[PDB]
Symmetry: C3
Subunit: 247 residues, 3 copies
């Protein structure tokens, strides 16, 4: 089994992230925690999720991987609230998924990990010009590029260190300017990258305010977003497809 009392609040954060990109979850429950990670069909979105130590009151595991009917758990798990603790009880078999929340017991027929889709790996990369900002201003920067230009610039190094999420389009443009001051941390390097704002939309559509956003900036490569979304108890790594940077 996988014994876990999970704070209710850790439920929508974990199972919603990949949603944007996959419906079916291959699930990995390892001895330190249980993680998640897949590429959407168009291969334009990869969010590696790693769930951490003591995020539930207890738990026991040894190997034990599951593909979950993510398309079904998605709304059923969301019918619950944060202030509750959750149980993950899956020792009987892999065809069912039992969960306990507010007196309600669930039984879901689960899929064998081996017949869904190949599971990705870690592009092994180390970028320079890494930035940080809170999710509220990061999504608000997205909301500004969400209609003028289609894709978002993360222009880094605008006269040595600087960031910019701007978008050029016919007869209208937009620039979000973000200096040092009151910007948690900086790594003042040289990289800037392009990305498609839409495939960013579905991604930060779930990130209101108070989530530290970390952007690994490099030149024209998949940008890495490192996150701890809830009380500071989780990560959601999003890589979006680059774009040629001319304009």
């Amino acid at each position: 089994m996988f014994k876990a009392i999970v704070s209710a609040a850790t439920l929508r954060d974990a199972l919603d992230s990949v949603s944007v990109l996959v419906d079916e979850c291959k699930i990995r429950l390892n001895e330190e925690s249980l993680s998640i990670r897949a590429v959407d069909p168009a291969n334009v979105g990869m969010v590696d999720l790693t769930l951490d130590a003591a995020a539930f009151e207890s738990y026991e595991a040894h190997g034990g991987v599951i593909g979950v009917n993510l398309s079904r758990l998605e709304e059923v798990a969301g019918m619950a609230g944060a202030g509750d603790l959750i149980h993950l009880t899956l020792d009987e078999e892999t065809r069912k998924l039992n969960i306990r929340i507010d007196g309600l017991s669930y039984t879901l027929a689960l899929i064998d990990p081996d017949s869904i889709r190949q599971e990705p790996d870690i592009p092994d990369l180390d970028l320079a010009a890494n930035i940080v900002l809170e999710g509220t201003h990061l999504d608000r920067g997205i909301k500004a590029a969400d209609m003028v230009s289609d894709h978002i610039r993360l222009r880094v190094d605008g006269a040595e260190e600087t960031f910019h999420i701007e978008a050029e389009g016919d007869t209208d443009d937009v620039d979000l300017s973000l200096p040092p001051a009151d910007l948690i941390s900086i790594e003042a390097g040289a990289a800037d990258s392009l990305f498609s704002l839409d495939y960013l939309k579905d991604m930060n559509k779930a990130i209101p305010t108070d989530a530290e956003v970390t952007v690994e900036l490099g030149e024209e490569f998949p940008v890495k977003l490192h996150y701890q979304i809830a009380e500071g108890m989780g990560t959601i790594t999003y890589m979006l497809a680059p774009r040629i940077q001319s304009d």
Copy 2:
């Protein structure tokens, strides 16, 4: 006339209940209070409403029955709020309906009771295994069967006394378990019944939290729901069509 200062809050509760099932209201104003009650066209829903003593500051009556343009009063009466008192003034004629709320006077041409539809009667039944629960957990039990199975089980007597609103469907199921403790009252009997969750949906779609739900449980028969929805000033009796109980 029918002189009634009705607390605004008693307006949406009274005229919304049948809505789910009928558009046209045959209305009965008797000397203790004025009540309501009809079967939807598909004959899969009957909510007998009985309005009680002193729910308005005053009132006078002697016979006097009305069929109301329920399809029109429905949104006009809902344009008002609870914190107001309402007047029911209908002595001039039966072709109009005058009501007073916030300085706004209304005049509706009303229908003669005798040309709409037959008005039902009280199935005369006394069931065993009667249950009680608050509307918030009752609708929340409905929300759980609202997508896995189509109809809701009220399984009563799961090893002598017990209740369960579970729903079986291909490769996925669900069970809501409800013991004694912190369940206002019980009548520990033997009956369990099936019902269609949809025709329950429209019914408890209006019941958030804090409404005592009373379920007359028997075996495969129309279940009776007894209610006092607002400050504890009204009833809405819902009978939903049974279903064969195999599964």
Copy 3:
């Protein structure tokens, strides 16, 4: 340039008013303030807006008129909140529009005032039977005529001084009765006028509660609505097409 720190709250009030009727804004920035005013295509709505002294912390002007891509500024300006101060910086050219809000700089290609549409003038009229009421009861009066009758009566002088927004329609009617008392001011005259409730809808769809509504009442003529929508810092003058007053 036009130097203006505008309270964020003055942004949605100013640019939303004409929206209901025009998409393209011919903009007039005069030495006391900058105003706005045009007739919708169907010529059934004219809202003359005049922005006043010190509504921004500072400003400089000399002539300088602009036609704005109102259809684009409309959602971009609304992506911001009230608690912010705004800058109107347009000295470089008339092809662009630069605005500053929360670190985000904007650049919009602007149109030359001379190629959009003729700009109206002030019907020069002085009516009698002028009324006043707060936007909350005025829109709530509109919400009552919004479904029974199509157009709203402003019947003035119902037995010397009185107001009424009533609407007659087949087998159903409605009347909103409004006396002296607790009705800020009156001018007890003789005029009553008709108007189309829809073209009033889009107009007071933006007026919740606490906005003084002033209705210049006369007989069958375009009614004038004088307003100060926000902390008491703006006007929106709406003239709606009369209607024959029979019924």
